[PDB]
């Protein structure tokens, strides 16, 4: 099946600047963007150690 | 705010940031204890800070006061984005000033071509990121349901409307989210969504405050 971890992270609609946390796999490293508070995908972190729980290593 | 221009410090008095360690949405003050806001921008721990113009430097008329408590419309669909509104109360009334003031609610709705004035610290560009130290500033025009269903086919509710500019270039983007629409001195709209910002037929997405000025005030009575 397809990895959430892989896939690149997503905005969304919302209007909102909250900085989350994705796994980016082309860096081996969890990274901080900007979410924009509603429709979040997976690849999706409140934390690094959050993202780096289930997406390390992918 | 694109394509908007530098309100001036202390010129839009209701506009607060909402603050969880960054600034991360916007907010109308609505009387010394409460602010309104949207539905997705609920966090624990929001700290409001009234009378900012420069968000990245203390400058001498901010007031920093911790929501005590933040309530969501008890029908936010966080799928489609119905009924897009928060209300938060502060932990302490705030002290109104000149640049500290509350924005009265509609007595009615507004109508398309109405002229508001859109306001916050959100994303300067529609494409890539530039985030403003001063508050930012932005007419625009209501627009029709029409016009609003055909940008969104199937994506505007009752509680929405659209405002802004068919060609591009001028709209809310990132971080303005929360944030006022006022036209002729009353609060209409909240900064809610669009595709992208300041897209060429894809004009910004408001909730329509004018629906919910009961339910507003009985929710600021019952707490
Ligand atoms: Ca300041």
């Known amino acids: 099946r397809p990895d959430f971890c892989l896939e690149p992270p997503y905005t969304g609609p919302c209007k909102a600047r909250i900085i989350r946390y994705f796994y980016n796999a082309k860096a081996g490293l969890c990274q901080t963007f900007v979410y924009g508070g509603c429709r979040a995908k997976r690849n999706n972190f409140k934390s690094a150690e959050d993202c780096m729980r289930t997406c390390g290593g992918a | 705010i694109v394509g908007g221009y530098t309100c001036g410090a202390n010129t839009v008095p209701y506009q607060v940031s909402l603050n969880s360690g960054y600034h991360f949405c916007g907010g109308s003050l609505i009387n010394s204890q409460w602010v309104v806001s949207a539905a997705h921008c609920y966090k624990s721990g929001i700290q409001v800070r009234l ?33 897009d509104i928060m209300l938060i109360k502060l932990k302490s009334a705030a002290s109104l000033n000149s640049r500290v003031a509350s924005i009265s609610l509609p007595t009615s709705c507004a109508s398309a071509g109405t002229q508001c004035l859109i306001s916050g610290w959100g994303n300067t560009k529609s494409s890539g990121t530039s985030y403003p130290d001063v508050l930012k500033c932005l007419k625009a025009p209501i627009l029709s349901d029409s016009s609003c269903k055909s940008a969104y086919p199937g994506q505007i509710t009752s509680n929405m409307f659209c405002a802004g500019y068919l060609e591009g270039g001028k709209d809310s983007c990132q971080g303005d989210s929360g944030g006022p629409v006022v036209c002729s001195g009353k609060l209409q709209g909240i900064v809610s969504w669009g595709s992208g910002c300041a897209q060429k037929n894809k004009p910004g997405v408001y909730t329509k405050v004018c629906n919910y000025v009961s339910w507003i005030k009985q929710t600021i009575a019952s707490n």
Request: charged share 15%; proline share 3%; net charge negative.
């Open chain 2, 51 to 83: 009378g900012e113009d420069n968000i990245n430097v203390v400058e001498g008329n901010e007031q920093f006061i911790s929501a005590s408590k933040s309530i969501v419309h008890p029908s936010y669909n966080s799928n489609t984005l119905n009924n």
